[PDB]
Amino acid sequence: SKPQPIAAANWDSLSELIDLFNSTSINHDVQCVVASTFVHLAMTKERLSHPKFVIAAQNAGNADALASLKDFGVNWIVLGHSERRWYYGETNEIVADKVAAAVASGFMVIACIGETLQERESGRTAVVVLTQIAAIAKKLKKADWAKVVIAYEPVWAIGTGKVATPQQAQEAHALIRSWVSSKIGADVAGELRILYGGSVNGKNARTLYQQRDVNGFLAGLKPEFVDIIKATQ
């Protein structure tokens, strides 16, 4: 069976969004995450009170900064999101180092991996994606995977004019899990949450979630997020 799903939203009125989240009864077991930028942190922190939600930082790579976040009550962090890699120049190793640092600092880490349009088109989804997570694994020890969540981000589907079928997402998630099973252990692979991190709405989320290897979502901080949460069953 599947591990606990996660519905995570990455940073519309934020205040109104939080109101909506706070008011949302979530009946099933699902860990909800709102990843904020530094500036919106204290506000999200004081406003978001739904106990099935946790707040996540993003991209912190400094030990002191990590320590401060943890002190501020932030225990989750999103790392490796597409733009960090394709725009900011965070290499597989830099992301890996951040993941390892965050884990060492007591964080739950949502580590994003994903291939570009050109990589997918040229048939290199597997080598790109697995190389990215292999870099992450190299800096972790087995026990650390308890603190790791992988988000698969079809970068290739973002502003490229391409769509992500349940089959495509399942294929990607399955190959990641198979690599984790082989290289890290089947016990780890069994517990590992692999989130689909491409643009998703209520309907397609519910369908995606039905796939064997999909354990939830990394999506937009938008009112539709409530539907993404409900989709995780």
UniProtKB/Swiss-Prot annotation:
GO molecular function terms attached to this record: triose-phosphate isomerase activity
Assigned keywords, A-Z: Gluconeogenesis, Glycolysis, Glycosome, Isomerase, Peroxisome
General remark: The enzyme contains a high proportion of positively-charged residues in beta-barrels V and VII (compared to the homologous regions in other triose isomerase sequences). Since 2 clusters of positive charges located at precise distances on the molecular surface are common to 4 glycosomal enzymes, it has been speculated that this might represent a signal for entry into glycosomes.
SUPFAM superfamilies the UniProt entry points to: Triosephosphate isomerase (TIM)
Organism this protein belongs to: Trypanosoma brucei brucei
Residues reported to bind substrate: 10
Phylogenetic placement of the source organism: Eukaryota, Discoba, Euglenozoa, Kinetoplastea, Metakinetoplastina
Sequence similarity: Belongs to the triosephosphate isomerase family.
Compartments (UniProt record): Glycosome
GO cellular component annotations of the record: cytoplasm; cytosol; glycosome
Pfam families attached to this UniProt entry: TIM (PF00121)
Active-site residues annotated for this sequence: 81 (electrophile), 153 (proton acceptor)
Metabolic or biological pathway: Carbohydrate biosynthesis; gluconeogenesis; Carbohydrate degradation; glycolysis; D-glyceraldehyde 3-phosphate from glycerone phosphate: step 1/1
Protein name: Triosephosphate isomerase, glycosomal
